[model samples]
Target: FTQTLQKDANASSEFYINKLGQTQELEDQQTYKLLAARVLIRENKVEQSAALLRELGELNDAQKLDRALIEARISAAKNANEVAQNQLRALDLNKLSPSQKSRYYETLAIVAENRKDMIEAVKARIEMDKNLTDVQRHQDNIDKTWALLRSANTGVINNASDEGNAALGGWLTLIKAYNDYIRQPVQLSQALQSWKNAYPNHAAATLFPKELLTLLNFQQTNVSQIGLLLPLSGDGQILGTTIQSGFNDAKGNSTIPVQVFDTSMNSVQDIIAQAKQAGIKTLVGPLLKQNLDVILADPAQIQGMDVLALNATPNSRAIPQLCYYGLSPEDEAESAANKMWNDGVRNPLVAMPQNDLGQRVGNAFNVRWQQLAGTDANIRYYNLPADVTYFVQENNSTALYAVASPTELAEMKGYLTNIVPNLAIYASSRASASATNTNTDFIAQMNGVQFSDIPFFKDTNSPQYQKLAKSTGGEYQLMRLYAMGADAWLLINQFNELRQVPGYRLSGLTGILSADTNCNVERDMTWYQYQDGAIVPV
Candidate 1:
């Protein structure tokens, strides 16, 4: 019966019940009832477990402890966290054996986690670790502690108000500092010094080894001269010139020189050869998708140089020493899905224009949303202005994820205010438009709409934007390219730093930049909402 219980609790419960039916002894019946109750609790039958516990009448000290723990578990399982916490708190933990104490602390941790009391959760785990006997169990407790600390947010863990245990507080602060070191190697010395000053007598002061400091001491390589390859003399001349102006503006007060190459006249091989001959180690360029495809097709042509493409290839394989940095609509759409999910919107209605870009954006959002365990988005592509009314009336979506032009957004906003006033909308950077005109009325109509965009439009007062504006005489219509150009220049120097720590973020004009294993620089954008005729950070 015990072996059966280990493998399958339901089977063992039935066996115990059948034995109880045939037995004449009251003690045997009580034992069987207790086992059955435990099984029921394990199976998440909370009410049934509670009834069985009540029927047990009176219990010895050990049996009473068991009953209390099981009842607490049942309360927690039922989402009655306060009841669970109070029940566990009433128990005399000193009277419990080591195993029982372990169980008690584990249950307490679960209750704290359910209540979102992270400090209590950490405290419980710390106590639970002391009672654990096996090495694997101790390691598991340590792993859980690290996960909890990581999720608790560094600032919260550092400033945790729980003044119960000084040692535990020091340990949490040390861990938070360690995480900071891992994320920013340049700040390693300062973080360690901060930990030392805060927790000098704590045992974790000696936790960081000499090897970690040595590992971080490696000098970062700087890209001296960048060879810029773009179609400066062809159909893409306007865009190329705008980006070039932004790049020049970003390189303000910096000594690193950039050599521009017009891809329209030079073949991919010739450009690579020219760059190599000029002793350029880094290359940022080939803005157009077709130009990038040409360069990527023959990887050997650009093997020796570090190439950063301005656009993502549709189906291209990852090239060695190459990183992709672009304002990808798909990426922005996916970010919108992530943002909406974080905002507690599970069922989102995707409203997009009936075009290829819109279709791609919608699909990207759907894929990422579903990946995060959200239900499929009810996607509706609109061709005419009247479609907004039909979309709003038909779908019962909790939120909206849209990819539309300024005109389309204005139209949708008018319809949404009358029909679905409270429905939150998430959009890509495209909805924000450029800094060409002061569409005050258009912006005012989009009162509740939230969107992400480059810092150039979002923060006009930023030093980088101010410098660029002053340099260009405030005539640049394509503001996004300016931010992108600035980021591209910054990326050349910081790519190694970014690669060293995946969690590290480089604040750029385009967005908060991070790199993936595939050599792609992913942009984490800033979100803003239109409020009272002006756009402000949300």
Candidate 2:
């Protein structure tokens, strides 16, 4: 319990795994195996956990709920949150113990939140609060539920205010009240009191969120001077300042000055300390994943400062004052899945490079396809797309998702069009139509192929794109860094709205930006289809 709550799922898994070596009783071994599966799921190895669970057969009725719970978790791990919710909804909760019910509803809450269904998330978490024995986790649940609830628009809150249990209604009304008097603390207090009088026995009535409780000291973070962290030496300098140029270009005429901290010149620790000491309330950058890991290791170092990291941290935990925005392969693959699904292609085959990046992006696309189509996409790894030309024919595919270099895509298209003639093709930004606008023959070869890329490329004629294109001259890879740098500025400037406002979107140079529940910035990229000699929006 200590290790699990302390966020060391690896240690927790090891404890049970070590027990498995010395333990003899068959029942105890089964229990340990199940427990190991649970912890492995927490470690985000859902496939291993699912396989671990499959090794057990015919668990007794008492163990069924736990098995079912793990099953639902596996579905969610596959990005089938809707399927996971259905798995939970299909359960008979009367057969579950208090602790089991608590765990079940907690998973339900998570699945709901993953789908951005706030009403289900709150209802499940509120119910979960009733069954939790841990005081702190209960408080944490309430806090997160409040965060999601507060982000809800007024109409959704009011419409759902009376739909479910009174506890759910109480939470809805509480947030509505918070919104009603956000600037008027006296009235906010009166509103809270009225809610308290109405639902005295509610889970939140006794132990409220510290944020709302300390509303008297509520002050929006006033970001004056900004700090930019990026590599300025070594091979990293070219990419770093490419992003810097876009950021500086966007800096335009603002009084808020940006201070640069070169990661290549110093340790991430010293850089952060220097930025903090320099009175930087808004910190943006740390482009290298290694430096981002430093911030994740000791999140408190960036405390009280609003951060917009150029790269993402592996840690999934939400930090209210921080957000991650970047050009990530995961975003590109997930975007490709949505495009294929919307184009009405159900069964699709993916051809990707035979490397770790391919595995990572392939899994992301498969999981997202699972979410939309209820089935995983067929994936094939290749040393080169020309070598994998048989993928569509072998898989009997009607649609194809390609992850390759720009020229590699042309090779795949030539071979694919020869074999399948009229297959629906979608691709990640890697197969983008940039840098080839002048080559009509090259663009014409990719006819009917749709791909995702940063929004700025969709219209180079736009003022934003023209400013940088003149300086950068549309180098595909570095060009993305430029747009990413521009979006980082918007992300940092409106970090609060992205966190607190529901459906809030910034039409950024990179993509349409929004923040998810976990404070990870979500980007919906612009889609383009290759035509006779040019690219057009799909």
Candidate 3:
């Protein structure tokens, strides 16, 4: 029956059940019932398999072990790893045969990996490899362990002593070298030399792929001329000038000559023609959203040149050869939704002002959260000096996504502190950025609230950011624009690389920059929280 089950599970299950009904002897009936249970388990009828095992009343040691293994398999299939791990640990390893022992160790490895305990997972894989009879399966398990070790963070690799494995030390050194290259790409040669010196006989020394080597030694593309098209005469003049200043700062010590063209002086088509005549291959602006729409609508104006817009369009569509990079509050709201879902908040409440910008942000959060299979958010709006107790009491939300001014956030914080003190709260950059002086004491009232922002505001210790802040005379909003300009200067040269390699990422001052299929350059931002009257990066 076991052999039959391997070939046709449904037929074997029926045959075993029929045999159980016809058997007269007690021993033969028990044998038929056991075979049926095994067949049911193989067919993925977990509840039926568990039921039959429970009815097999008096079992010997071997039967007891078989029952426990089946139960553990059921739990593991359901993703109840803690329960599965406990059941597997209760079994005596000496009693199991070689193949059964291999299965046991493999299941243990999966449970450990699910819990993010890579060190223990590697130990389990090593044991599984010893018991595996097939050469290919043994090698596959070893390769999987090596891949896990390579991707593990520094903390897990540093604790290799607990596993008592010498191979882990070599893997730790290799991962450290890879991380060094990522943090500072210009030092790739030194990092590679260090790795060769430390592990001369390692397989990676001979097997490292050529494409990765090329990526590590990548250089920024060189352009002959760059043009900046910005509004230099209207209300947008100050903003365009601020971004140009940041571009100039990023271009310091480099021999790239840049020319600025005023978009207000001529038509978008005329400006593009003028830039092309001046041999400009890259164009950087059109700061206002209205100007961007006018320029992007006419394909002729942006046909041959590579353009990077300062803001996204209303529809968020990406045009060919044009990358949309901007400080959209909508992006921040979507990121908040993703963060909340990652933190295990399935039911969230969105609170914002009764305005257009607030509605846009709330809609962005809702769209992303629903895409992640989260429940529909309970969105609420607040007016000045209004009561929020009704909104708090009506919904059973575990988290809050707040998009409001500092004054509005203060009011919401008071309501939350008095009503639902345990609910997790997330806010946008609006609550953090102060126009004149940051009110640290007021911000301290909402401790444990997480928010996202650009690196210029989140990372004060960054030297380049500090220089830009000083250059802007400490204007909070302009500094964000400055970071955008800095990224624009760097991105124009790497636009081809970003478009060619979908997986490639550029570490920019604004965020970790990556291009999507729509030609939109998305920024993955840094997170922070207020702790003891001071904002610190989390």
Supply every candidate's count of residue pairs whose N, Cα or C atoms clash at under 3 angstroms: 0, 0, 0
Residue 33's lDDT in candidate 2: 69
User: How well is each residue in 119-174 modelled by candidate 1, as lDDT tens digits?
Assistant: 77889887886786765556666666656666676667767754768768776765
Best by lDDT: 2
Query: Model 1 Cα displacement at 98 (Å)?
Result: 16
- Candidate 3 least-lDDT 10 residues: 1-10
How many pairs in model 3 have backbone atoms within 3 A of each other, for residues 3 or more apart or on separate chains, i.e. clashes?
0
lDDT of 1 at 471: 64
* Deviating ranges (above 4 Å) for candidate 1: 1-144, 151-221, 273-279, 291-307, 314-322, 338-346, 371-373, 394-399, 411-427, 432-451, 458-477, 516-519, 524-538
**Which should have the higher TM-score, number 2 or number 3?**
2
* lDDT over C-alpha atoms for residue 312 of model 2: 78
Across residues 80-195, which tens digit of lDDT does each residue of candidate 2 receive?
A: 98898899888898877676677788788788788888888888887888787777777988888898887677788766646647787788778888888865555676787778
lDDT of 3: 0.71
**lDDT for each residue of candidate 3 in 415-451, tens digit (9 for 90 to 100):** 8766677778888777766542257567667677777
Candidate 2: minimum summed lDDT over ten consecutive residues — where? 1-10
lDDT for residue 324 in candidate 1, whole number 0-100:
86
When 1 and 3 are scored with lDDT, the better candidate is: 1
